[PDB]
Amino acid sequence: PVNPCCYYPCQHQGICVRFGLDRYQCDCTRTGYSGPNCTIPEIWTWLRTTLRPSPSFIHFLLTHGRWLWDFVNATFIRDTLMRLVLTVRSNLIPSPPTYNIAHDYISWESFSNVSYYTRILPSVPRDCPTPMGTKGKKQLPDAEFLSRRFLLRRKFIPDPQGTNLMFAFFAQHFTHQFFKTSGKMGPGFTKALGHGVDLGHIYGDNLERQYQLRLFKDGKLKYQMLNGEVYPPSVEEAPVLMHYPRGIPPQSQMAVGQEVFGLLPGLMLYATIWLREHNRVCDLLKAEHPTWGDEQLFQTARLILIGETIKIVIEEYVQQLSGYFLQLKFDPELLFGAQFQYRNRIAMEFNQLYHWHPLMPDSFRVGPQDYSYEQFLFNTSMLVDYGVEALVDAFSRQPAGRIGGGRNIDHHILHVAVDVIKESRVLRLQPFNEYRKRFGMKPYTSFQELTGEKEMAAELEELYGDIDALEFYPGLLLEKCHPNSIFGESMIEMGAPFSLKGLLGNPICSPEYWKASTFGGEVGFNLVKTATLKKLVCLNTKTCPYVSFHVPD
Amino acid sequence: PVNPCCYYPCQHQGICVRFGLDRYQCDCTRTGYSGPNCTIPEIWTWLRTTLRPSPSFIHFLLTHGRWLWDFVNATFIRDTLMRLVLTVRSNLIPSPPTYNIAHDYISWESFSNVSYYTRILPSVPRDCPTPMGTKGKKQLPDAEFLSRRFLLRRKFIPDPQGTNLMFAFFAQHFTHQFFKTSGKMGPGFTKALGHGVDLGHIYGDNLERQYQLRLFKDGKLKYQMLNGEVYPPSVEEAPVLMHYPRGIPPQSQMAVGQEVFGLLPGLMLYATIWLREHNRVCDLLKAEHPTWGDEQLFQTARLILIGETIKIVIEEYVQQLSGYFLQLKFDPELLFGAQFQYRNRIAMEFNQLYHWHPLMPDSFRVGPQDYSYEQFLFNTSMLVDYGVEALVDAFSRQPAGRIGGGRNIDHHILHVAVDVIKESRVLRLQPFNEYRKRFGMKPYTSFQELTGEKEMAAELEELYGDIDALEFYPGLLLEKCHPNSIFGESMIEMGAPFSLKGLLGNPICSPEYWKASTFGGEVGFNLVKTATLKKLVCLNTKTCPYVSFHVPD
Ligand SMILES: *[C@@H]1O[C@H](CO)[C@@H](O[C@@H]2O[C@H](CO)[C@@H](O[C@@H]3O[C@H](CO[C@@H]4O[C@H](CO)[C@@H](O)[C@H](O[C@H]5O[C@H](CO)[C@@H](O)[C@H](O)[C@@H]5O)[C@@H]4O)[C@@H](O)[C@H](O)[C@@H]3O)[C@H](O)[C@H]2NC(C)=O)[C@H](O)[C@H]1NC(C)=O
Ligand SMILES: *[C@@H]1O[C@H](CO)[C@@H](O[C@@H]2O[C@H](CO)[C@@H](O[C@@H]3O[C@H](CO[C@@H]4O[C@H](CO)[C@@H](O)[C@H](O[C@H]5O[C@H](CO)[C@@H](O)[C@H](O)[C@@H]5O)[C@@H]4O)[C@@H](O)[C@H](O)[C@@H]3O)[C@H](O)[C@H]2NC(C)=O)[C@H](O)[C@H]1NC(C)=O
Ligand code: COH
Ligand code: COH
Ligand SMILES: *[C@@H]1O[C@H](CO)[C@@H](O[C@@H]2O[C@H](CO)[C@@H](O)[C@H](O)[C@H]2NC(C)=O)[C@H](O)[C@H]1NC(C)=O
Ligand SMILES: *[C@@H]1O[C@H](CO)[C@@H](O[C@@H]2O[C@H](CO)[C@@H](O)[C@H](O)[C@H]2NC(C)=O)[C@H](O)[C@H]1NC(C)=O
Ligand SMILES: *[C@@H]1O[C@H](CO)[C@@H](O[C@H]2O[C@H](CO)[C@@H](O)[C@H](O)[C@H]2NC(C)=O)[C@H](O)[C@H]1NC(C)=O
Ligand SMILES: *[C@@H]1O[C@H](CO)[C@@H](O[C@H]2O[C@H](CO)[C@@H](O)[C@H](O)[C@H]2NC(C)=O)[C@H](O)[C@H]1NC(C)=O
Ligand SMILES: CCCCC/C=C\C/C=C\C/C=C\C/C=C\CCCC(=O)O
Ligand SMILES: CCCCC/C=C\C/C=C\C/C=C\C/C=C\CCCC(=O)O
Ligand SMILES: CCCCCCCCO[C@@H]1O[C@H](CO)[C@@H](O)[C@H](O)[C@H]1O
Ligand SMILES: CCCCCCCCO[C@@H]1O[C@H](CO)[C@@H](O)[C@H](O)[C@H]1O
Ligand SMILES: CCCCCCCCO[C@@H]1O[C@H](CO)[C@@H](O)[C@H](O)[C@H]1O
Ligand SMILES: CCCCCCCCO[C@@H]1O[C@H](CO)[C@@H](O)[C@H](O)[C@H]1O
Ligand SMILES: CCCCCCCCO[C@@H]1O[C@H](CO)[C@@H](O)[C@H](O)[C@H]1O
Ligand SMILES: CCCCCCCCO[C@@H]1O[C@H](CO)[C@@H](O)[C@H](O)[C@H]1O
Ligand SMILES: CCCCCCCCO[C@@H]1O[C@H](CO)[C@@H](O)[C@H](O)[C@H]1O
Ligand SMILES: CCCCCCCCO[C@@H]1O[C@H](CO)[C@@H](O)[C@H](O)[C@H]1O
């Protein structure tokens, strides 16, 4: 008997449950629908669904009225929209969390074992006809082929939104605090417990490692002057597990908090920047609170960075990305009147979706010089050689690459993408379409409809045999980009929910914590309330270079 | 310079912060008050405080209108009150959690290190004049003396509310899943991570121990027939760490999930009862879901018990306790429209406050027999000798003891109480009065006012020198009981908030989880929605004895 839940009968988030040897029941509870498979809109659901504009349309309004927006921007109408934005979007990620690689059903294990990444949709039953469930071929496209054929960059396509490398890296560094898949435990597990913006990639992810990094004096972090400028310390004082290549484990072999952050100047760069900031906060705090210990100074400064980060990420990172005219804003109080759970837990689909490797260029221009992957990767002096000031200016100036569209992932790293499609399969993630529904969209009716063109499209149909069988990662990256956008529809509609749910779900954002005494003093709060990429740098360097998440000109 | 926060200047939950070498500032944020120390009621706070009846009064209404209540009971007016009850009470326990033994301020460490118990009020600064802060003597009463003098039982005072031993034990067993102080880590730390009703005292508190107990077949739990009746298994199959005395580690040396549950028949009794229930659920589930695995069967049945427990605890345990005419009710949906965080974290004051050791009798009557502490403690056959049926009937019939009033803790265990007063001091818990304010009450103006009498009172003043210096645990147990109540005012007003916050804060109670498919089937939900002490027993025994949380007659 074929496991009925293999057809995904239940609609609108209705839970599919096996009853007896061959039947199933949908638990349409609170889905707004009723019926065998939840397809009978309650009175209000019916209204809502007949009045809600297509996402396509909203993205339109949000990217056009360059007059209506400037007005709306200078009025409460902003807070109103922002509050709307958050709620609606954030109301899509189940919390408390639901399933994990081990359980396709609620369980006390799932709730509490923070090691497990969590999923939005159950997984494809280990007994369904096809690998994706019902449609498709008994075999999925060879990820190696599907990769070089559609994801491999031929000619470098830059990002029309003007995104830049200074962003590309920040993106990598930042996301690496919640995404830390434990090789030992395999796919679907994570070292980075905490699931969020806890900067556990600066201060590390275990008390020890933290301590090993902590200079236990003035709540500061350990560091070393090179050329008279401050940099992170090396294992020779900061005796902590790293990943530098077997060659010079002593000097220029720096400890940071994120095990792998030495393998690229970009990461190590930012790493230098944040550490150099933390210690800066301390100086301020310490002057404001002489009678304070070390632990305090440390903890308080940390939170002030969890704030600064959550702010820059929203009012600048997500801004650039969106392309909106609405001026996104970070004000924890906007949700003070809603029903919101301050608690997140990184999802595997969120992980998958965040693999924006095509942002990476062809080479790395740092002034007249023009390093290559060989010269760049694992390099171990570019940072101290060039200097923060100079290296930020260099990244803030070179453009990044379009994330979507298809065929724009440099070859060097093209391997990452192949593993994702490999991993995705191990995890048994449901089909793109299934995830499209889940995030409030319509399933594509054809590859032609998916991809703006016809070539790529036809070739894929020929492979997957059915649009419904298409996969999560390939779809997202093979989907047509919104006009002049960094990427298509599905990336925002699927990403934003995971994104803001995690940004505002941080404890520091709850009413309980969002006080001026949580950042010890009014000086703390204001540091969190007025943060900026520009300040994050120019306040920790001798000189103010050019910096932003978008190229100038 | 004396640490100003030693005076506890800030009022109404205003955070005290040291600024400079000798000053301080109160962060009255969202306290409803403003001013140097938060003593200027906002317009509405002023209304609220001038219209809110004394707690003393409400306890009166709740324990008198035996006509108005029967009516109110048979109408929506019930749900209204219940919803009121929850919210207001639960809105007193900060969540996300605040401080811990290590930090008297918000911190990412405090939030995430689940090992730390958490506190409501900061601690007494390690530099304040007196041990309690400002008032009192440079030395606190000798806990040994203060104990025998006021907490040691002379004549057994039974509980007027009719509470019984069947309750006394359930109480002990149940509370032992959140209270597990780690000796290695010391006071203020806990083995029982999870902080709540996760039955991590049945299924254990680590995957291993659980597994070691799991019979990995039909999602059941390991067990052994003795006399033809089901009992937990012994380490000889359930190879797990226990605590039975060095004598017969083989048979009658049962494994349960709560390391110390062999040291008393009461605990082991209940232990037998729940295990015998879990397996029962499985039988039901398994028949409803043949196509189900083991993991599911297990996890689903677990949740069905986390439900059953949370229900019996509320509609029966808290009922008996309260003395209310209002018929408490467990309906997770009553909070569906509120702003409630489904997340708890046991507090140390909650721990302290729950030390109801005086519930314990003088001897243990089990029919014509009348065991003593020697015969009872560590006994290891009474359970299988007598039998669940018979031993429940025996406890449900013998009365327990009044918790408050003073002088009612049997000598045998009188030692526990002494450690509590010792520990309390290590933790540096603020004075009774400070905790009285914090939970919405008025500080006592005298010991005479505290204690209903004059003798005990005068002697204490003579010791503490000042009512304000009085301690948390001694105050609670030395406070005058509400007329005919099991204990006084401060126990309910301080206990209920910690209590319901933890009962309804359980993930299974959130909208997300409270579906019929979380207990797999409608059969599951109903098991959770109609649980009862009576059913918990009589459905897992050959015969229905007498059982309740109050003696008959
Ligand atoms: C979060 O969740 C992950 C799992 O998803 C946790 O990590 C896994 O943890 C389990 C258990 O800790 C571990 O178990 C594996 O299973 C092996 C099988 O064990 C044997 O088979 C049964 C199972 O208990 C026993 O009957 C066997 O008999 C034993 O009985 C004696 C009793 O004393 C034993 O002493 C003796 O060895 C005997 O064989 C036997 O145990 C197990 O042996 C082996 O250890 C193996 O690891 C998983 O492998 C873990 N790893 C992962 C990533 O899956 C993780 O701990 C959870 N996080 C937290 C903190 O809760
Ligand atoms: C929850 O929170 C509790 C704490 O409240 C955690 O448990 C405690 O954890 C800490 C650290 O893991 C542990 O530390 C103690 O401190 C000793 C001091 O260590 C020395 O002094 C400093 C501190 O790092 C170092 O400079 C010293 O030099 C060392 O440097 C080398 C670097 O490689 C070392 O290899 C070498 O040994 C050298 O000495 C030195 O480390 C520490 O040595 C000792 O281990 C001691 O335990 C506490 O004792 C822990 N216990 C408790 C209950 O307090 C708990 O882990 C947290 N929970 C979680 C899971 O996060
Ligand atoms: C948008 C973020 C981002 C960027 C810009 C980025 C840029 C680069 C880059 C350019 C200099 C190189 C050489 C690599 C190289 C790798 N990356 Co990324 N990675 C990024 C996000 C990730 C994530 C997420 C993972 C998966 C593992 C994890 O962290 O959970 C990853 C994994 C990898 C792996 C391990 C195998 C795999 O999972 O496929 C390699 C090798 N990489 N990455
Ligand atoms: C209302 C619950 C309850 C009951 C009825 C109860 C009944 C009994 C009892 C009667 C047969 C005996 C002989 C004991 C004996 C002890 N109890 Co309790 N205890 C109870 C709740 C606790 C708590 C709570 C602790 C503190 C440790 C922990 O679990 O965190 C405790 C601790 C102890 C300790 C360790 C030292 C200490 O912390 O003081 C001993 C010994 N006991 N207990
Ligand atoms: C790491 O980066 C440094 C730059 O700091 C590389 O050295 C540069 O190499 C280019 C040519 O490759 C020269 O024209 C520059 O003048 C060099 N700068 C300096 C001061 O070294 C170095 O080759 C890189 N290392 C690796 C592993 O390739
Ligand atoms: C443990 O409990 C048993 C009861 O099961 C105790 O045995 C009883 O002892 C009394 C007198 O103390 C006798 O009158 C009963 O008839 C006995 N019952 C049985 C069948 O043993 C036993 O003494 C206790 N053990 C300890 C350590 O005291
Ligand atoms: C509910 O979901 C099932 C599964 O998709 C739908 O399909 C079943 O019934 C169809 C109607 O004739 C048949 O086409 C299929 O043979 C049958 N498939 C399965 C898996 O049972 C069913 O139609 C849906 N019902 C509604 C209300 O649309
Ligand atoms: C605010 O709190 C402080 C601390 O309790 C109060 O006490 C200070 O001021 C009092 C007024 O004269 C003096 O009696 C004390 O010397 C002084 N003590 C301290 C610790 O500074 C202060 O009065 C309070 N202010 C208000 C508005 O009541
Ligand atoms: C859980 C930790 C925090 C993770 C998230 C932080 C940054 C994620 C970056 C992008 C998220 C995915 C899609 C974003 C696209 C447009 C943003 C605006 C959407 C909106 O508002 O309408
Ligand atoms: C965190 C896990 C759950 C712990 C709590 C479970 C049981 C606790 C028992 C008693 C709690 C403290 C005081 C109770 C007194 C009266 C109850 C009704 C109060 C009310 O409603 O007005
Ligand atoms: C408590 C009421 C808060 C304000 C309610 C605003 C209702 C907006 O409802 C609609 O929701 C849609 C989501 O699909 C959006 O796309 C629309 O722009 C929005 O107008
Ligand atoms: C003019 C802007 C009006 C408000 C825009 C809200 C932006 C989010 O947009 C909407 O969010 C919902 C929640 O996930 C989704 O169901 C919809 O598909 C999406 O378009
Ligand atoms: C208040 C109404 C303002 C004008 C609304 C015009 C909506 C135009 O429609 C939009 O056009 C885009 C490109 O032209 C498409 O990509 C979108 O799918 C479509 O919604
Ligand atoms: C406050 C939010 C109201 C809903 C979104 C309105 C989006 C308006 O969008 C744009 O407005 C311009 C006005 O000058 C027109 O010229 C554009 O054609 C129109 O698409
Ligand atoms: C959203 C409105 C929900 C119902 C509001 C009921 C207001 C009850 O307000 C009062 O609060 C006091 C707390 O100190 C109780 O003691 C009183 O009995 C209660 O009447
Ligand atoms: C007739 C019953 C009306 C509602 C009774 C509410 C029971 C709780 O009572 C009140 O709870 C508040 C919240 O902690 C406290 O501030 C008050 O001190 C307490 O009396
Ligand atoms: C609606 C009003 C109904 C009658 C209210 C009578 C309140 C009586 O008052 C109560 O008396 C108790 C003992 O007599 C005291 O213990 C309480 O402190 C007091 O509030
Ligand atoms: C629905 C809740 C209303 C507020 C609580 C009312 C408590 C009433 O309390 C009791 O009511 C009896 C009525 O017969 C009187 O005889 C008692 O003296 C009075 O104390």
Tab-separated table of C-alpha atoms and ligand atoms in Angstrom, chain B residues 2-11 22 24 26 35-40, ligand 8:
chain	number	residue	atom	x	y	z
B	2	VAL	CA	28.241	51.541	50.321
B	3	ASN	CA	26.709	50.029	47.152
B	4	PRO	CA	23.462	52.036	46.959
B	5	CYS	CA	21.554	49.135	45.390
B	6	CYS	CA	21.997	47.721	48.894
B	7	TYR	CA	19.004	49.759	49.947
B	8	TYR	CA	16.840	48.507	47.123
B	9	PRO	CA	15.856	52.090	46.184
B	10	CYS	CA	14.013	51.214	42.986
B	11	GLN	CA	10.377	50.207	43.436
B	22	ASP	CA	28.819	56.266	44.212
B	24	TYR	CA	22.718	54.771	40.920
B	26	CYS	CA	16.486	53.256	38.337
B	35	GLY	CA	10.770	58.960	38.942
B	36	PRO	CA	14.094	58.586	40.787
B	37	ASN	CA	13.032	55.219	42.193
B	38	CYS	CA	9.794	54.550	40.282
B	39	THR	CA	7.263	55.973	42.728
B	40	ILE	CA	5.082	58.161	40.504
C	8	LIG	C1	15.158	57.092	46.197
C	8	LIG	O1	15.808	55.998	46.862
C	8	LIG	C2	16.809	56.412	47.823
C	8	LIG	C3	17.368	55.144	48.432
C	8	LIG	O2	16.432	54.559	49.325
C	8	LIG	C4	16.168	57.289	48.897
C	8	LIG	O3	17.119	57.641	49.947
C	8	LIG	C5	18.052	58.676	49.758
C	8	LIG	O4	17.406	59.945	49.947
C	8	LIG	C6	16.682	60.004	51.197
C	8	LIG	C7	15.902	61.309	51.212
C	8	LIG	O5	16.504	62.259	52.083
C	8	LIG	C8	17.631	59.894	52.387
C	8	LIG	O6	16.857	59.520	53.517
C	8	LIG	C9	18.792	58.883	52.214
C	8	LIG	O7	19.933	59.426	52.863
C	8	LIG	C10	19.198	58.552	50.769
C	8	LIG	N1	19.756	57.215	50.735
C	8	LIG	C11	20.393	56.801	49.643
C	8	LIG	C12	20.596	55.302	49.474
C	8	LIG	O8	20.804	57.580	48.773
C	8	LIG	C13	15.563	58.506	48.225
C	8	LIG	O9	14.907	59.313	49.189
C	8	LIG	C14	14.535	58.019	47.231
C	8	LIG	N2	13.899	59.150	46.596
C	8	LIG	C15	12.571	59.210	46.568
C	8	LIG	C16	11.945	59.882	45.344
C	8	LIG	O10	11.855	58.734	47.469
